[PDB]
Amino acid sequence: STPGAQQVLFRTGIAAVNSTNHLRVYFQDVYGSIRESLYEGSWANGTEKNVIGNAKLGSPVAATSKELKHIRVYTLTEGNTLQEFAYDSGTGWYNGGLGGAKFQVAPYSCIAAVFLAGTDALQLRIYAQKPDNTIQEYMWNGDGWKEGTNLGGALPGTGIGATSFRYTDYNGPSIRIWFQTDDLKLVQRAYDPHKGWYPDLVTIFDRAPPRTAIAATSFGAGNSSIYMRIYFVNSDNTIWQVCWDHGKGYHDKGTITPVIQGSEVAIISWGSFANNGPDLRLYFQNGTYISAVSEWVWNRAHGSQLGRSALPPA
Amino acid sequence: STPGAQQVLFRTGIAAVNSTNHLRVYFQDVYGSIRESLYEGSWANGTEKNVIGNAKLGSPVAATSKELKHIRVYTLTEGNTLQEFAYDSGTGWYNGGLGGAKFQVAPYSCIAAVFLAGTDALQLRIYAQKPDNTIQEYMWNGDGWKEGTNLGGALPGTGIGATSFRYTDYNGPSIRIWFQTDDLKLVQRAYDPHKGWYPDLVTIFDRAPPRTAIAATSFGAGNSSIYMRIYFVNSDNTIWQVCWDHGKGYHDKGTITPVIQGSEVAIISWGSFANNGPDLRLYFQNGTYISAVSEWVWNRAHGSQLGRSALPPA
Ligand SMILES: CC(=O)N[C@@H]1[C@@H](O)[C@H](O[C@@H]2O[C@@H](C)[C@@H](O)[C@@H](O)[C@@H]2O)[C@@H](CO)O[C@@H]1O
Ligand SMILES: CC(=O)N[C@@H]1[C@@H](O)[C@H](O[C@@H]2O[C@@H](C)[C@@H](O)[C@@H](O)[C@@H]2O)[C@@H](CO)O[C@@H]1O
Ligand SMILES: CC(=O)N[C@@H]1[C@@H](O)[C@H](O[C@@H]2O[C@@H](C)[C@@H](O)[C@@H](O)[C@@H]2O)[C@@H](CO)O[C@H]1O
Ligand SMILES: CC(=O)N[C@@H]1[C@@H](O)[C@H](O[C@@H]2O[C@@H](C)[C@@H](O)[C@@H](O)[C@@H]2O)[C@@H](CO)O[C@H]1O
Ligand SMILES: C[C@@H]1O[C@@H](O)[C@@H](O)[C@H](O)[C@@H]1O
Ligand SMILES: C[C@@H]1O[C@@H](O)[C@@H](O)[C@H](O)[C@@H]1O
Ligand SMILES: C[C@@H]1O[C@@H](O)[C@@H](O)[C@H](O)[C@@H]1O
Ligand SMILES: C[C@@H]1O[C@@H](O)[C@@H](O)[C@H](O)[C@@H]1O
Ligand SMILES: C[C@@H]1O[C@@H](O)[C@@H](O)[C@H](O)[C@@H]1O
Ligand SMILES: C[C@@H]1O[C@@H](O)[C@@H](O)[C@H](O)[C@@H]1O
Ligand SMILES: C[C@@H]1O[C@@H](O)[C@@H](O)[C@H](O)[C@@H]1O
Ligand SMILES: C[C@@H]1O[C@@H](O)[C@@H](O)[C@H](O)[C@@H]1O
């Protein structure tokens, strides 16, 4: 009997952030509280003393950070408005200004969030789904939350993945997002600084389960080069991985590890192929002590393997 | 999708009652309200005006009836107590007495309910899971609510199916309940009016997905004879049925119909092999309009066949 694991909501939203191998993982408990687990040389926390806020039961959970100096965690209120819990080093946790804006979204909306890459400025872009079923970008550039670009129609309840990177030869940040459309395909939308939003949808998978989880990362930004990894729960009840590798494009897709039916998914990465990396970490529920969150590991030494069997508080 | 279907909670609890082919189906909308869809010659209702109460988001939903003259619907409060919405013919809906007893159960608890068969009296047995993860029976015999028999440990957050029937050569009701044990097996416990609860767990399936939905019915009671069907979501993302048939015992098991990953399941039945039945109706989510509730049908005319594609309000 595992009372810690029982505290984790079955099919909880999962988010994660890191600065290299210093890790934080956010999940919802059975009372709807959002808890933090931590890895600093070893795993710790995720107890009822480690609550950073509350949200509607079954809320999406997204997170983004600048190393571990600035963290932001996004969930839905009971009123189906976006809200934000902020960490700043030297300040600690507090309620962020997103809530005050009262952005009404679909009750079944998911959320994705990024800090724009390649600047020390605190610039945020959030993605969620309006009641008309369109994907809307919400922006912070230091003087008030505002609506950004609307990205058009999606499957109601679609998962949303997002990443920002800055090519080392470019003067500004790039954004990529992924969601599912009404034909059930999983698709990419792309922002470059000299182009804005590309007009076209690029398909990364032909038929995925409806409202499947979608999580994304990128690493190894070079001169007009990037590496990206996208993950979703396929109809075989495993997480699949779609690979973008510089010079190969979208050239591989395949299963990675079993999950529970309807598992949510989070991804973090650090390093690069050029410098004896990258490291990858996935987080999901695969049924360990029934409801615990489990970890998957990719590194250069031993490749693909299962990491922590059961995260705190399990 | 459709605006109507969007209001149905993805992976909602489902329950159903009937008097022969006069049908009622209960489900949870995205706001946490419990709604009723109706079949009287055709399908109707399931809108915001067809709400019988509110329950915590993601609550189990169970319902039992004596024909359509008395219906009881059971869910969890926000404080993880058992509650009851009652319908009596010529009284209407009201809040049933159960909530006042403040029966505290595990936040991840499911619920099953039955009116004891073969009497006129309103006798009820409710099954849910205590915080110590044991399955507890809760009784009403016309003289207040009280705890009945404890039936021991089960998987935290187990599904629970239950049925009551009366062997025609007996002056009293039998009860059968199904749930999932800590070893991930699916098991039966049994109550007969002479022997009480038999000490032994009977295995109906060797290993099922953690916290899989479990729904059961029985029909065609005779002298020392009975037929029963147990439904669950197997790892192949489909509903499986386990058959008890008089003289064959537990002799057949197999897939019936595909569902979304982690779909809930409800079953109703009427009639008998003896008289050009029985009739079966399964309710579940299969991805029709993304989040609408669909129906499967068994009858003697056509056999296994899909029924209503999308219940109201889709
Ligand atoms: C006394 C009588 O026959 N009344 C009927 C109602 O029962 C019926 O209500 C519907 O069915 C009941 C069992 C519940 O499910 C209600 O929510 C339904 O509205 C209404 C509508 O047909 O008709 C009479 O009032
Ligand atoms: C004899 C009689 O008519 N008694 C009724 C009760 O049945 C009724 O209670 C409800 O119905 C029962 C079966 C349980 O489900 C209770 O928890 C319900 O409250 C009440 C309605 O208030 O009225 C009489 O006591
Ligand atoms: C210039 C500066 O540092 N201003 C901070 C501002 O960043 C804080 O706002 C928070 O963090 C930002 C990036 C968003 O997530 C906001 O929604 C959030 O409130 C603000 C906190 O009150 O304090 C300013 O000094
Ligand atoms: C008429 C009678 O008493 N028959 C019993 C039968 O009820 C017992 O079997 C139980 O009931 C059936 C429906 C299944 O649920 C069985 O798995 C369950 O054990 C049986 C006990 O072995 O004994 C018969 O006499
Ligand atoms: C950064 C660390 O990497 C490996 O050592 C894993 O076993 C840990 O859980 C953690 O992910
Ligand atoms: C970056 C910070 O690191 C630790 O001090 C944690 O206790 C905080 O909650 C936060 O994760
Ligand atoms: C980084 C860019 O910033 C603004 O110009 C937005 O309107 C775009 O949507 C994009 O997010
Ligand atoms: C990293 C790459 O960036 C642009 O070239 C896109 O058109 C590609 O689809 C890919 O996203
Ligand atoms: C970073 C690694 O890149 C390739 O080696 C993939 O096959 C691995 O799964 C991993 O994504
Ligand atoms: C009793 C009725 O049976 C069939 O006609 C189904 O098509 C209906 O939806 C209903 O279940
Ligand atoms: C029908 C029976 O009623 C009482 O005797 C309960 O204690 C039993 O558990 C059973 O529910
Ligand atoms: C009443 C019927 O019983 C058997 O024939 C099963 O094969 C059917 O699926 C149905 O359960």
UniProtKB/Swiss-Prot annotation, chains A, B:
Keywords: Lectin, Metal-binding, Repeat, Zinc. Sequence repeats lie at residues 1-52, 53-102, 103-154, 155-206, 207-259, 260-314. Residues 1-314 are annotated as: 6 X approximate tandem repeats. Pfam families: Fungal_lectin (PF07938). Alpha-L-fucose 5 binds at residues 229, 241. Gene3D superfamilies: Fucose-specific lectin. Alpha-L-fucose 2 binds at residues 72, 84, 97, 145. The keyword rRNA-binding does not apply. Multispecific lectin that is able to recognize L-fucose in all possible linkages. These could be found not only in decomposed plant matter in soil, which is the natural environment for A.fumigatus, but also in various epitopes on human tissues. Mediates binding of A.fumigatus conidia to airway mucin in a fucose dependent manner. AFL adopts the six-bladed beta-propeller fold and contains 6 binding sites per monomer, each located between two adjacent blades. The 6 binding sites that are non-equivalent, and owing to minor differences in amino-acid composition they exhibit a marked difference in specific ligand recognition. Homodimer. This is Fucose-specific lectin.
